[PDB]
Design a protein around this ligand. Structure first.
Ligand SMILES: COc1ccccc1[C@@H]1CNC(=O)CC12CCN(C(=O)[C@](OC)(c1ccccc1)C(F)(F)F)CC2
Ligand SMILES: [Cl-]
Ligand SMILES: [Zn+2]
Lengths: 314, 346
């Protein structure tokens, strides 16, 4: 209730209701290390916070003391935990909290402790009704916020809310087709629903992926996915894909494509294929092209594959 | 341009000293800062500039100890800092019980790592306790929390466990089979490792997983050659000029280690571009205050200084000891531990 920056703010140490508690100071003793200096008003709040902790006190006054200590440092895991204890003890309307946090996560959406506190509140309420809409609001500010995606993946798993998340993916790839975080969510959704082993879903997905290369071909994230959803089936086994990519070579060539092809020719070699002597050279033409002029910052990685391919297959 | 060894010392000196209430948010994890500074100096061979003996006291002041009655074995390890308000006790007197006081996996890790670096022999570490607490942090899924009270779990702490177990030279502190599941479970459709099964592949995660296995000595057993091959590609595809944390993201000095070390453990760091890694790293070096930031013309911090310097050390940069890439301490300190172990084994 008493705002930390009200004119009439008063220290806890000159507060009537708090007269009876002896505050607890922090002491790092003779040599401190990475000492933080702390204001009057701060050390006060945290001197009383330590006291109320020491004494496992399940008061209201304590519950309010937490909000003030979270204001000064929302990184203090202990403060959050103790707030969660008072939420339990005092039997607090968890919805009032689920709003209190929504505000703080916005101000601090890389903060582990608040993403946790929101998760706990949903495990308690078993109510994901709020979650997907709120996470897309955080994702609208940072569409690669690892905390937000973690939470979203956990909600969608824990309350099997899969029905709309593929549409949401399709939307955020229309938004930034280069977002590694969204190509992940796509495979997360499919891999936990349809699964890829339906031949028809695979046609769907490989087609969709290629469209988004024709659209923007220098995009690791799309090629990663194409390889992803195919590499365990055997890149060799789809000869319409090999021939399709060879026809992009002139206009849509990227290190990502040339690579893909090497990885096809490697799988072909692995699946004792027709023309080891020949395929190998097709793969080495490419390892050399990569090193020579396509993917030069891996000059020596691609050279090393050249050596690795010849030693597996001669 | 060129590496400001002298200033990078003056920098780490400062970290260890004092900071304003602007840094409030580090209170609950000062020991990790301490580590970045102290390994920082250890890595520049300028540890002499600190009061080792007096820091070793501070560190030990942070160890959570078993009580008279050993009820609280599950809650032992180290604290981030004294912020709970416990009487200063450099592991002299026994446990002083407190509902909420308990260790933190990252601090148990950074605490031990610091002590070894500083010279101390871990004699005052109650190992059985730290290990007991460590175990109590592991979940069904094989990953770890950071505190018994509950918290995020993910690959970071799998590493922290791996490192504690490695340093105490006693893997009793974890269920390695389950830990190893979590690591394997966590590989992505792009063959990078993620915070945990499902999530985005990420250079930090990827390190933690790989190094954790390398510490367990199971890297070879846990992933097929085909797998390690796909993992290596993921990692080396992270270099654009400086390495980035995850694909289609802009570089950061810190990954010039996270991914660097990953590649060095997979025995192919040699096939990276050294000139562009070095430029980019130095590109961030702050020439007025010292240290390094994630990006250039941009404010430097203890972590990005340590990791920049370590990521340079991976390229046998001049004036910086070889870093031990799985254990994240100077090779000197790693050698210093070999001995500390050959000693206990009698
Ligand atoms: C997705 O984020 C990551 C995942 C896995 C590893 C590393 C990172 C990341 C790298 N760069 C950063 O700026 C922050 C991060 C590393 C420091 N962090 C810690 O938690 C850490 O030091 C502060 C740590 C120390 C050594 C190893 C792993 C973590 C602690 F464990 F000691 F607490 C937070 C994340
Ligand atoms: Cl190497
Ligand atoms: Zn960084």
């Amino acid at each position: 209730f008493l705002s930390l920056d009200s004119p009439t703010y008063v220290l806890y140490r000159d507060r009537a209701e708090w007269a009876d508690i002896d505050p607890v100071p922090q002491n790092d003793g003779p040599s401190p290390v990475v000492q933080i200096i702390y204001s009057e008003k701060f050390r006060d709040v945290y001197d009383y916070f330590r006291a109320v902790l020491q004494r496992d006190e399940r008061s209201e006054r304590a519950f309010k003391l937490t909000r003030d200590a979270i204001e000064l440092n929302a990184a203090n895991y202990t403060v959050w935990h103790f707030r969660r204890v008072l939420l339990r003890s005092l039997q607090k309307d968890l919805q009032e909290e689920m709003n209190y946090i929504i505000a703080i996560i916005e101000e601090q959406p890389k903060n582990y402790q608040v993403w946790h506190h929101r998760r706990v509140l949903v495990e308690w309420l078993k109510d994901p009704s709020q979650e997907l809409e709120f996470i897309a609001d955080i994702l609208n500010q940072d569409a690669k916020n690892y905390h937000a995606w973690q939470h979203r993946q956990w909600v969608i798993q824990e309350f099997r809310l899969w029905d709309n998340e593929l549409q949401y993916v399709d939307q955020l790839l229309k938004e930034d087709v280069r977002n590694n975080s969204v190509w992940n969510q796509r495979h997360f959704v499919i891999s936990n629903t349809t699964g890829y082993s339906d031949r028809a879903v695979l046609e769907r997905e490989v087609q969709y992926t290629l469209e988004m290369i024709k659209l923007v071909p220098h995009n690791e994230s799309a090629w990663n996915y194409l390889k992803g959803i195919l590499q365990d089936r055997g890149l060799s086994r789809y000869p319409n894909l090999l021939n399709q990519l060879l026809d992009l070579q002139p206009s849509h060539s990227s290190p990502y494509l040339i690579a893909f092809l090497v990885d096809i020719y490697e799988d072909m070699l692995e699946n004792q294929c027709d023309n080891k002597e020949d395929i190998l050279n097709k793969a080495l033409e490419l390892c050399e092209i990569l090193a020579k002029e396509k993917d030069t910052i891996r000059k020596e990685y691609w050279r090393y594959i050249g050596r690795s391919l010849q030693s597996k297959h001669s | 341009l060129d590496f400001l060894r002298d200033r990078h010392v003056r920098f780490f000196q400062r970290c260890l000293q004092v900071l304003p209430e602007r840094y409030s948010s580090l209170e609950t994890s000062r020991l990790t800062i301490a580590f970045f500074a102290l390994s920082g100096l250890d890595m520049l061979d300028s540890l002499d500039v600190v009061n080792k003996d007096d820091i070793i006291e501070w560190i030990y002041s942070l160890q959570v100890l078993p009580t008279e009655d050993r009820s609280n074995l599950d809650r032992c390890g180290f604290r981030g800092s004294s912020y709970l308000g416990i009487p200063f006790n450099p592991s002299k007197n026994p446990g002083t019980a407190h509902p909420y006081d308990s260790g933190h996996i990252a601090m148990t890790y950074t605490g031990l790592s610091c002590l070894i670096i500083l010279g101390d022999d871990l004699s005052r570490v109650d190992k059985e306790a730290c290990l007991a607490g460590l175990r109590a942090l592991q979940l069904e899924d094989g990953s770890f929390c950071a505190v018994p009270e509950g918290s995020e779990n993910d690959m970071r702490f799998v590493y922290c466990a791996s490192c504690i177990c490695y340093m105490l030279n006693n893997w009793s502190g974890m269920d390695m089979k389950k830990a190893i599941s979590y690591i394997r479970r966590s590989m992505s459709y792009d063959n990078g490792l993620a915070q945990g099964a499902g999530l985005e592949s990420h250079g930090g995660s990827t390190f933690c997983g790989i190094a954790s296995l390398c510490l367990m000595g199971k890297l070879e057993e846990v992933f097929s050659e085909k797998e390690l091959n796909r993992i290596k590609r993921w990692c080396i595809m992270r270099q654009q000029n400086g390495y980035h944390g995850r694909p289609n993201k802009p570089v950061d000095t810190c990954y010039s280690f996270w991914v660097g070390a990953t590649l060095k453990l997979l025995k192919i760091f040699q096939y990276t571009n050294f000139e562009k890694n070095r430029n980019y790293i130095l590109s961030t070096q702050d020439r007025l205050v010292g240290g390094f930031a994630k990006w250039p013309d941009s404010h430097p911090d203890a972590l990005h200084a340590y990791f920049g310097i370590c990521g340079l050390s991976l390229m046998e940069e001049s004036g910086i000891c070889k870093v031990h890439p799985a254990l994240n301490v100077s090779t000197r300190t790693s050698e210093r531990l070999r001995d500390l172990h050959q000693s206990w084994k009698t």
